Design a protein around this ligand. Structure first.
Ligand SMILES: CC(C)(O)c1coc(S(=O)(=O)NC(=O)Nc2c3c(cc4c2CCC4)C=CC3)c1
Ligand SMILES: CC(C)(O)c1coc(S(=O)(=O)NC(=O)Nc2c3c(cc4c2CCC4)C=CC3)c1
Ligand SMILES: Nc1ncnc2c1ncn2[C@@H]1O[C@H](COP(=O)(O)OP(=O)(O)O)[C@@H](O)[C@H]1O
Ligand SMILES: Nc1ncnc2c1ncn2[C@@H]1O[C@H](COP(=O)(O)OP(=O)(O)O)[C@@H](O)[C@H]1O
Lengths: 795, 795
């Protein structure tokens, strides 16, 4: 059968990368991304049979993380008899470097290119569209492929179409919808796919763990003692060991070490950044005319989208056949390419330091993946313009480089930081990569003074290290938002430089899986004498009652903390009991406290009240969305009635309240001169509860200014009472009353009351309340009648 | 309800054929045809629910086998309440004789023609397309219906289309796809219809068995004594009783006997062939002007495709209304037709002996069914041109006939036999039918001298008799291939005339269900002193160890047998033990023996070796595809090392071998001067095994010439060893090495070795081995460098 012939063909083709792929291969860390380990067998398997088409799978990875090697290993395993031997007919390796937009070819012609025979049985293949898979590797082919509106989609596979249109039709499941796809791509090209996909399954590639680094370093060196020595020399440099999570850096450093050892020379060289790694690799593998030819060749390829280089183009750039080095890898189809596109990048940067030679036009034109790649370009550029590496590079390669380009890059980063450009293109972490690449402290200080509001999302150890370096070097940061993915080991490094910073005032960690150990580390950090953090948000950090002990320690030790948030954490009654110990200290200067939806009950209300009568600083307390109950609110109000209480804003939204507690609240309104705001949204107070409250709001000593009563189940019966409030309350300024069936007569009474000049009110919230056209017209008459009084009643 | 009205209509219409159909009907033999008894209820039922339009059923039968009667009986049974009273709404009797291509009508028009009412509820019928059956009887209507490219297919049953296009749309399931079909057809019309079908279910009609012949002979004659007398008179004629498997011949002979008995005359007339039957029927039912008119009418109908004759056409051929005979059946729609199309055939032939009158133009124009029918034409013509029947026919009917037409038919068969025309039109058995029809020993002997390579398939006793007659009368047959369908009863007669032949040398019976009794009969045949068979192939004949006893008897008795093949038969160790008794006899001249996939083990290897050291004639032994093992191969080799052993070619393909036995093989290569070939494909010898073998092939006394090592699990490590062979082996000429991962360095070493003039090798098989373009180009440069050395490396 031709099936076994094709299997043997792909097994022979993908056996080596020569060196054996099976010997070379090391397992990578694969994790599912989209949330409401992973194996390939279950990867193509549907998690839910109800799910819309599973067979679309997108692999996400950095440059050199091993997407191509992963796809080739999948083909090798499938051919060798390991992956889906149950039933899955064919796998087609569409290497997007070969695919070009200008050429007009059909799917049959593409399979012809992927088949070993000049006349494979294509019709039999098409007869089984459900058993066909396409490994689309490297969606990073060129620019302008999809930035325009997609033209007509082709379903007739015999028809010849352009590369872009054919790929769009294949991806969008219009051409052979039953065919399966697996696309290895970049995050920006991931955004492009998300603009061209419908329910795909996303899988991330992380690379090598420490054990996998052991495995790779043992597999590379044929001699076990040599491998042990090389890895031992790697160990004492933490930067290299952290960077080695990417297999490409492992390969480069192993090649350098092997070549130096074959020459019998010292292996002790160390590279601070990626640029230093590449520079030492080139120096080991390295006349100036040949360097200029290579640089111009790379620049031409970058500008004109040409990755596979022909002999004519090679000749155009002043390079002879005798100039072929170990950098260019050959593929006879006669074509030359680079080992990885990052090398073409590095040589293009070297060109820009040694195609237009102005960096401004390079920076202006962005699009598709290449923008980040062009930023990746400047990344190596950022590395090369350094007071240390430039001198040694010029000495080694006998070259000359200027430094106005560094000032131009500084202007570019200034513009990028000051530019708002939210949620557009790679924004924050990549700039930190560039700054860490340069490693010039003075430039870093001059460059990060434009950042202050910093928001980053970290997923790898290298991300943690670069963020730590940048935040430590910064001196004008005020607000800092951290996101964590897939912790405490590198949190111990981040939080130290967060504490040492003398300009930070905010610290947002909401919506993370910080956990109890992470919160313990953060609290150990916050106890530092030099800490300056004044606001700390911890919403939905997955915390429990265990973190409250450490938070209480911080509150009893830290005199600068002013605001704190703990919303959506299951602290519980015991958590609040632990927290109130710190809250009652004399060194606790906390002013605002959020406890919305902390799974509290009426039991903890005895503790919080003790804080209100004792805390000399706590003014604004929000305890909404908790089953406090009428008894709990009564317990709070029993201590809140004291005129010495400093409480100003109180939040009881959706706190499961009835009218029974309202009288107690009224007492506070009669006695507390400090309570200016009070939110009661979502509580079924009722008309009797509103009357009991108005008994207190009408008191001469009441100083309330804002009151919310949304969704309080208020009918027309109470509409008179509030009217009596409006003419009499000399302090109330705002009042929200949405989500009620007050009725048209009630709003008529309100409008009749408000036309007087004796009302000091300035806002009424009647949104989500539906009224007939006469009432609406009355409200417009009122709203342009009284400009200072605002009513919201939009339909 | 109109359903019951139409049921009553068809029940009344199909009650008689007058005589009652139920009284007349006799059960026919029905069998499924396509392979990887049958009853109509399961025949419409799907064997597998996964099977694709099961509802399409095609019936295959000879002329007069009873396809029309079977369809009419099915319709009568369905109307009477016997076939699918569960649920199946309508069956429509589309008699293809009525359907014409010129007339343009719709499906509703056809149903109206098949309906008794001028305005049937057609829309209600279309509303239930899954409960509609179309019974297309006689797909052999006319010529040119489908020989051209099929035009556009019509799906709108309202639209009027031509007969050919409408039938194509209906059959191809484009017009009412949910409708079921049942087509009765001819084998050549089967070919054409299968060129218009997609997964149909084929059912073959065989006719009457001996019990069914008894039943029909009792049913026809109303008097039991008369029926017994007629059957007793018929039975003593063996040829007539064999031809009686066709119901039409039974009807003709019964009508003749009944008419002769009514006239009180003798019934002793005997007919050797079908032509004699028809001639005696004519004599019983039979002025010369009327005969010429009938003959011209039949010829005109044959040439212009007109089966239903009008009175205008009747007058056109000099036939008056007073000339209406007992043959022409009338159908008032006013139309005349023949009893069967075979009668129109016979009268067209009679015209050709008594429209163009040249037989050459008759023979040239063939197509559709009619070609065979036209051959059917000449079949009766072949009967009529005889030294015996012609004189009696001329005396009876007062006619004159010439004999140059016989010479023209002889030239036609000369051309047909000389013409290659493989797998095109009716080729071999039908010519035998014509020759048996003529019954002239001189003409048959002169005509069969150009047959020699005969390949025929037999399914009925009539086929056995005609083939036996033709083979017995032949004198220049060399090769003879027999196929059997659905045995020994007529094999006992066929094999006798096979043995008596003094020119036969080969006898191929591969892929039959010959079985042990059949092989016993064949062995009794082969022991005849006059047998001349020299090669006997018996692959996959379903043989077992029981036939080996008889084969050993033959080998000990038959001294002319030279080659014998027993591949794919479960002979087993005991079978080989029985065979080796005959193989070791002094009168056994067998030279070549095949035992591929005979379910052998290492146990039988002790016996085969005893043959090698004893058999003075066995030179080529093939025992591949058996689980012989290393021990078995060692047992063979320890006897094959003998210098006096005459073994030349040894086959061990896929014999489950390892390197352990290879050394033993090496010893044979060092000792046996006669071993010139050795096939080891599929055995995991390995590089160590290849080295052990090359220890032997490099011996000065080794005389091997061809060696195969495909799929031997050979890596690059052994590539040096074979190279040492190439420069040193002075006898090897061929070497095959496909299905290996030899590597590019290995083929480079081979090419470097081969460019020397000292290499006597002439062939290397590197197919299915995949190499890069440099290795490819080197391979061509070598192949045009050395024209005498051929390498196969096609991609
Ligand atoms: C900011 C974010 C999320 O890390 C990102 C955005 O875009 C990309 S990437 O797709 O450009 N790939 C890379 O940067 N790979 C890459 C990395 C390092 C070192 C090297 C490479 C390539 C060779 C040396 C160290 C971390 C990533 C990554
Ligand atoms: C070679 C092969 C397989 O027997 C064949 C090929 O084509 C056809 S047939 O379809 O032309 N039908 C017939 O010959 N019927 C037929 C036969 C006999 C006698 C008569 C008839 C018709 C009336 C008398 C004796 C055997 C067949 C048959
Ligand atoms: N599983 C692995 N084992 C060993 N090396 C790997 C592995 N995956 C990737 N590499 C290294 O990565 C380099 C190629 O990376 P590549 O697959 O091109 O990354 P990408 O697909 O993201 O461009 C190779 O030099 C190879 O040594
Ligand atoms: N089951 C049967 N019982 C009795 N006679 C039959 C039967 N089937 C066919 N015949 C005979 O065959 C003749 C018609 O054959 P027909 O059905 O037209 O063959 P085909 O359908 O192959 O043309 C009739 O004269 C009838 O006597």
């Amino acid at each position: 059968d031709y099936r076994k012939k094709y299997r043997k063909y792909v097994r022979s083709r993908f056996q080596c990368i020569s060196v054996s792929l099976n010997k070379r291969y090391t397992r990578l860390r694969l994790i599912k991304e989209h949330r409401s380990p992973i194996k390939m067998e279950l990867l193509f398997d549907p998690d839910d049979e109800h799910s819309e088409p599973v067979h679309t799978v997108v692999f996400q990875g950095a440059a050199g993380i091993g997407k191509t090697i992963l796809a080739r290993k999948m083909m090798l395993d499938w051919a060798s008899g390991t992956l889906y031997q149950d039933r899955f007919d064919y796998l087609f390796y569409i290497h997007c470097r070969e695919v070009s937009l200008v050429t007009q070819r059909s799917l049959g012609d593409l399979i012809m290119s992927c088949c070993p025979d000049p006349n494979p049985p294509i019709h039999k293949i098409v007869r089984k569209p459900s058993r066909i898979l396409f490994l689309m590797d490297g969606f990073d082919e060129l620019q302008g492929a999809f930035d325009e509106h997609i033209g007509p989609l082709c379903t007739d596979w015999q028809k010849a179409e352009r590369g872009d249109i054919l790929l769009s039709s294949l991806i969008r499941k219009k051409l052979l919808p039953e065919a399966s796809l697996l696309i290895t791509t970049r995050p920006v090209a991931l955004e492009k796919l998300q603009h061209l996909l419908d329910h795909p399954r996303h899988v991330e590639i992380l690379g090598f763990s420490e054990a996998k680094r052991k495995e790779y370093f043992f597999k590379y060196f044929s001699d076990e003692a040599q491998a042990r020595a090389a890895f031992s020399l790697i160990q004492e440099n933490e930067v290299l060991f952290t960077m080695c999570f990417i297999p490409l850096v492992c390969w480069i450093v192993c090649t350098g070490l092997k070549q130096q050892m074959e020459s019998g020379k010292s292996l002790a060289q160390t590279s601070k950044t990626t640029t230093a790694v590449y520079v030492f690799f080139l120096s080991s593998l390295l006349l100036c005319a040949h360097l200029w030819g290579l640089c111009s060749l790379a620049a031409d390829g970058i500008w004109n989208q040409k990755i596979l280089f022909e002999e004519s183009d090679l000749r155009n750039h002043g390079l002879q056949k005798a100039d072929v080095s170990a950098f260019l890898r050959m593929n006879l189809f006669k074509f030359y390419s680079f080992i990885h596109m990052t090398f073409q990048e590095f040589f293009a940067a070297m060109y820009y330091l040694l195609p237009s030679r102005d960096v401004t036009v390079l920076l202006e034109n962005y699009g598709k993946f290449e923008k980040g790649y062009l930023i990746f370009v400047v990344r190596f550029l950022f590395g090369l313009v350094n007071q240390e590496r430039t001198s040694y590079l010029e000495k080694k390669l006998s070259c000359k480089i200027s430094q106005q380009i560094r000032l131009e890059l500084l202007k570019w980063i200034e513009v990028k930081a000051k530019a708002k450009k939210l949620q557009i293109q790679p924004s924050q972490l990549e700039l930190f990569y560039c700054l860490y690449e340069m490693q010039e402290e003075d430039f870093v200080q001059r460059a990060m003074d434009y950042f202050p509001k910093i928001e980053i999302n970290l997923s790898t150890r290298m991300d943690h290290m670069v963020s730590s370096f940048c935040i430590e070097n910064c001196h004008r940061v005020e607000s800092l938002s951290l996101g964590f993915l897939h912790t405490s080991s590198f949190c111990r490094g981040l939080f130290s430089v967060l504490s040492t910073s003398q300009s930070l005032t905010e610290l947002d960690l909401s919506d993370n899986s910080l956990g109890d150990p992470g919160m313990r580390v953060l609290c150990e950090t916050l106890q530092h004498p030099g800490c300056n953090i004044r606001r700390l948000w911890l919403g939905r950090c997955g915390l429990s009652h265990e973190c409250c002990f450490d938070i209480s320690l911080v509150l009893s030790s830290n005199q600068k903390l002013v605001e704190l948030d703990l919303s959506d954490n299951a602290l519980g009654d015991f958590g609040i009991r632990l927290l109130c110990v710190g809250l009652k200290h004399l060194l606790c200067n906390l002013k605002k406290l959020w406890l919305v939806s902390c799974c509290l009950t009426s039991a903890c209300c005895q503790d919080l009240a003790s804080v209100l009568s004792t805390s000399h600083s706590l003014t604004r307390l929000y305890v909404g969305e908790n089953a406090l109950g009428d008894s709990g609110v009564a317990i709070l109000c029993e201590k809140a009635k004291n005129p010495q209480c400093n409480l100003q804003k109180l939040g009881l939204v959706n706190s499961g309240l009835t009218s029974v507690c309202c009288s107690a609240l009224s007492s506070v309104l009669s006695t507390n001169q400090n309570l200016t705001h009070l939110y009661l949204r979502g509580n079924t107070l009722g008309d009797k509860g509103i009357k009991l409250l108005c008994e207190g709001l009408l008191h001469p000593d009441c100083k309330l200014q804002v009151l919310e009563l949304d969704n309080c189940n208020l009918t027309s019966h109470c509409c008179w009472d509030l009217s009596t409030l409006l003419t009499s309350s000399q302090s109330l300024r705002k009042l929200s009353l949405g989500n009620n069936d007050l009725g048209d007569l009630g709003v008529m009474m309100f409008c009749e009351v408000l036309k007087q000049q004796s009302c000091l009110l300035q806002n009424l919230g009647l949104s989500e309340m539906y009224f007939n056209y006469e009432t609406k017209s009355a409200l417009e008459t009122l709203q342009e009648e009284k400009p200072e009084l605002t009513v919201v009643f939009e339909p």
